[PDB]
């Protein structure tokens, strides 16, 4: 078994040469951002959401 497989049929493991390490494929992903602001007639201050 050189590489594993997940439900979504994507690569999640690999057999690196000379080390035989696990080396899971793509653990890290993106992150979401949202903006909270009041009406333009009051002010223009904003807040950042995750």
């Amino acid at each position: 078994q050189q590489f594993g497989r997940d439900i979504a049929d994507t690569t999640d493991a690999v057999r690196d040469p000379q080390t035989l390490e696990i080396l899971d494929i793509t653990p890290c992903s993106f992150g979401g951002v949202s903006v909270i602001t009041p009406g333009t007639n009051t002010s223009n201050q904003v807040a950042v959401l995750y």
């Binding site: 997940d6 979504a8 994507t10 992903s29 979401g32």
Partner: peptide
């Protein structure tokens, strides 16, 4: 939570995000 509420809670059991309820 109520004991009935607790029983009901116990009975109920990659590019995707789930919005938490408000």
């Amino acid at each position: 939570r109520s004991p009935i509420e607790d029983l009901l809670f116990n009975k109920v059991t990659k590019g995707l995000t789930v919005l938490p309820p408000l």
